[PDB]
RNA sequence: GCCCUUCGGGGCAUUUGGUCAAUUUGAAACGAUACAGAGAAGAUUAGCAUGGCCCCUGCACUAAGGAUGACACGCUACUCAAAGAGACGCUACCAAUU
């Protein structure tokens, strides 16, 4: 039942994730940022051929 | 304030900063309501694009979606003739039933 406080392991894999995670979401968060606070860029980068371009 | 002094003097430290704390008049946007109302030459519609002073959602400013996201569907002389054939064109208008 109840009562296992042995908790530094998953603690412990809990903050390589968030190492992880860190460059990734400081990355998307700031793009967040650039479309709210100056607008969306919206062609002008050129969309590559897909495959419904084709 | 402190320190030094040869008691005359000298030293240490040196220029911040975000338009006020004040919501009518220097800029928020839905929803409700009203209304209308969805592409491809009969009917019904899978979509993929194209162009940018149209954008939205998205990390994607090298996905995807948004009705195939929408827009598109008005308007329409102007580098501009030549041949040969006509013209009471350019003037006048005119005297017998028995």
Known sequence: ???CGFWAP???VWLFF?????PL???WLGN??????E???SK????TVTKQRV
């Open 1 to 3: 039942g109840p009562g």
């Open 10 to 12: 998953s603690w412990r």
């Open 18 to 22: 968030m190492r992880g995670i860190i």
């Open 25 to 27: 979401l400081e990355r």
């Open 32 to 37: 967040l940022l650039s479309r709210q606070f």
């Open 39 to 41: 607008g969306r860029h």
């Open 44 to 47: 002008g980068v050129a969309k």
